[PDB]
Design a binder for this molecule. Structure first.
Ligand SMILES: *[C@@H]1O[C@H](CO)[C@@H](O[C@@H]2O[C@H](CO)[C@@H](O[C@@H]3O[C@H](CO)[C@@H](O)[C@H](O)[C@@H]3O)[C@H](O)[C@H]2NC(C)=O)[C@H](O)[C@H]1NC(C)=O
Ligand SMILES: *[C@@H]1O[C@H](CO[C@@H]2O[C@@H](C)[C@@H](O)[C@@H](O)[C@@H]2O)[C@@H](O[C@@H]2O[C@H](CO)[C@@H](O)[C@H](O)[C@H]2NC(C)=O)[C@H](O)[C@H]1NC(C)=O
Ligand code: FT8
Ligand code: NAG
Ligand code: CL
Ligand code: ZN
Length: 604
């Protein structure tokens, strides 16, 4: 470590800690920048040499974290929790947690290389036929549009085998090293560290309570869709009292069901809410999608994207053969000037929502870029994942779609309200059990309750318990199906997305009220409301300088997560689905919990 980057001497009191924190920030932007730059070079150009430079930059950041983290612990560990300045507590509390910098050098290198190899394996896996298919776009498009049971099965099985099986031995080694590192920071395991970000002694209980309020909405949506799959695929493949086969819901992970809307739409006389075809007819490209998302932000008097964003971002999958990480992500280079999105954008309405999701992250970065780096975060990680989703709730309304030229006909009748709210539910309600269960699985792995000998046994227990799905071919412990989901090999926590999907309806209700809107919640559009813009900007400029409970209270009037706004948004289709399911005499749930589908006749 460069002498200029090493901490000096500071007194062991609160006044000394103020100067320590200032001195830390003055060096940290440089170190953070070089690490983001090296990760950007790798994820937009996966090569062995670019992995090697990324691991070298990671090692420098670990040296920096060790020098400052040890000094902070030595000077302030007994006392920082009593400091009068709550921003100072936030900063010092972060610096004394070293994470992987607790590992000796040889294990640091092992750790950095494991992350490199897990990322390469996930983002370069292919499914070849008996010329090979990538996940994005090839397999994504098959899962979304094919209605041949056997083609869907071939893609689903092929993807889970290709990505999961080789990941398993690396993921075991990663888990052990991660736990060894954070145990030296005082956390019982890595999962406990991740849960600490929510600053709540009752977190797990509070989540269970939320899900108990939401589960009935999921069970009715589930049974209604299951009936529809029955008519299409028949009794041989669909058990009206068992789990749904995991490959038939339009998405590789069965996490969002919007791609089978055409199969379930209650009233097809009304205007087709699937506006993708119109986007194609009109010539929309990826850059147009981003410009339309930007103009919603500026209509609220939030910031445009700076020139550095347009010149630096990767908004399409490269045509030149490069291997890249296609999973959509947003990037803060910690220099107050460079901010980018990396997305293999495809021209669809669902992707237009993802564009808003990622641009919400960049807007957060723009609004807090002048805080100290330790505070350039969301109030919690759920806040970050929700910002763009909130605006896209307004964009999705048929009224807004009309205003931007993607929906021609105009109707305001109960049947049209039902089509809209069902299409939204296929995305927002279907996701809830998946957003909840993923980190239940990972917390059990980190705690040792789930050893390698039960990785897949326990994955499928939770997938069946919560989503009511089952694998369409037989699995055993050679498979590692959790590993075939981006966030597991790329070590990105997941409970933030369950929090986000509840939070975004709390945000929407508040901003619609501030906008002066007085109609049904699900018809609100906050476009061009400078008052709603100013209330959102307060949240974004706070970063993590204040407890998320306080920030939320200012915004919506309540200091806790609450499912009632979500329930109120969906109320009308909740009632409709209950009545459809009673009328058809459905069983709510999957009491034949053992059931799996047979194979197709001469498969492959
Ligand atoms: C589509 O039609 C529905 C009615 O079928 C419209 O909903 C109604 O919209 C009005 C407009 O403000 C709402 O009026 C408000 O009522 C509350 C009731 O407490 C009151 O506090 C306000 O001062 C205001 O008068 C009304 O509540 C709402 N719901 C009804 C009539 O059942 C809707 O606006 C129409 N949407 C579009 C896009 O045209
Ligand atoms: C674990 O499963 C694999 C894959 O096949 C699964 O199990 C079969 C019995 C069948 O039900 C498939 O639909 C499942 O997906 C097993 O590996 C295969 O074993 C069969 C023998 O039955 C053999 O014909 C194949 O060549 C094998 N495939 C590969 C890639 O090796 C495996 O034996 C099962 N057990 C263990 C411990 O891994
Ligand atoms: O969050 C992200 N990308 C989105 C894009 C698709 S939509 C969205 C809502 C649904 C749940 C979740 C899903 O797709 O599984 N999700 C995403 O992953 C990125 S910013 C996560 C990330 C952060 C840092 C480095 C790398 C990645
Ligand atoms: C990809 O990275 C290599 C280094 O391994 C570099 O030589 C090459 O120019 C890069 N390609 C692009 C398109 O940036
Ligand atoms: Cl999280
Ligand atoms: Zn995100």
């Amino acid at each position: 470590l460069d002498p200029g980057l090493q901490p000096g001497q500071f007194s062991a009191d609160e006044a000394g800690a103020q100067l320590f924190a200032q001195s830390y920030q003055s060096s940290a932007e440089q170190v953070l920048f070089q690490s983001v730059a090296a990760s950007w070079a790798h994820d937009t150009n996966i090569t062995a040499e670019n992995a090697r430079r990324q691991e070298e930059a990671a090692l420098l950041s670990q040296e920096f974290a060790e020098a400052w983290g040890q000094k902070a612990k030595e000077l302030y560990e007994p006392i920082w929790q009593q400091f009068t300045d709550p921003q100072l507590r936030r900063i010092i509390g972060a610096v004394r947690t070293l994470g992987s910098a607790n590992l000796p050098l040889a294990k640091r290198q092992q750790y950095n290389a494991l992350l490199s190899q897990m990322s390469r394996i996930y983002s370069t896996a292919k499914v070849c036929l008996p010329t090979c298919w990538s996940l994005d776009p090839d397999l994504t498009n098959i899962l979304a549009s094919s209605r041949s049971y056997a083609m869907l099965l071939f893609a689903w099985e092929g993807w889970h085998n290709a990505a999961g099986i080789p990941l398993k031995p690396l993921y075991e080694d990663f888990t052990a090293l991660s736990n060894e590192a954070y145990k030296q920071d005082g956390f019982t395991d890595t999962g406990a560290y991740w849960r600490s970000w929510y600053n709540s002694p009752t977190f797990e209980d509070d989540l269970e309570h939320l899900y108990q309020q939401l589960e009935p909405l999921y069970l009715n949506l589930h049974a209604f869709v299951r009936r529809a799959l029955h008519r299409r695929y028949g009794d041989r493949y669909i058990n009206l009292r068992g789990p749904i086969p995991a490959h038939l819901l339009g998405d590789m992970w069965a996490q969002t069901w919007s791609n089978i809307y055409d199969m379930v739409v209650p009233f097809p006389d009304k205007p087709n809410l699937d506006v993708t075809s119109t986007m194609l007819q009109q010539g929309w490209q990826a850059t147009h999608m981003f410009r339309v998302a930007e103009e919603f932000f500026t209509s609220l008097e939030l910031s445009p994207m700076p020139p550095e964003f347009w010149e630096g971002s990767m908004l399409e999958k490269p045509a030149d053969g490069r291997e890249v990480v296609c999973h959509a992500s947003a990037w803060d280079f910690y220099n107050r000037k460079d901010f980018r999105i990396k997305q293999c954008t495809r021209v669809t309405m669902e992707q237009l929502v993802v564009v808003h999701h990622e641009m919400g992250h960049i807007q957060y970065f723009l609004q807090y870029k002048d805080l100290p780096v330790s505070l350039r975060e969301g109030a919690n990680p759920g806040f970050h994942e929700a910002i763009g989703d909130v605006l896209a709730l307004s964009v999705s309304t048929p009224e807004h779609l009309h205003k931007i030229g993607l929906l021609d006909r105009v109707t305001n009748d109960t049947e049209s309200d039902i089509n809209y709210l069902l299409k939204m539910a296929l995305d927002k309600i279907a996701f809830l059990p998946f957003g909840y269960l993923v980190d239940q699985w990972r917390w059990g792995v980190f705690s040792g309750r789930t050893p390698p000998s039960r990785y897949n046994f326990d994955w499928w227990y939770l997938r069946t318990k919560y989503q009511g799905i089952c694998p369409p071919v037989t699995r055993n412990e050679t498979h590692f199906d959790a590993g075939a989901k981006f966030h597991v090999p790329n070590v990105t926590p997941y409970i933030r997305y369950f929090v986000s999907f509840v939070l975004q309806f709390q945000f929407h209700e508040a901003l619609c009220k501030e906008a002066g809107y007085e109609g049904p919640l699900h018809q609100c559009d906050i476009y061009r409301s400078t008052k709603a813009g100013a209330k959102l900007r307060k949240v974004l400029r706070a970063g993590s300088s204040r407890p998320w409970q306080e920030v939320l209270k200012d915004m919506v009037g309540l200091d806790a997560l609450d499912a009632q706004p979500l329930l109120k948004y969906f109320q009308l289709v909740t009632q409709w689905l209950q009545e459809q399911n009673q009328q058809n005499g459905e069983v709510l749930g999957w009491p034949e919990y053992q059931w799996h589908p047979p194979l197709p006749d001469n498969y492959p």
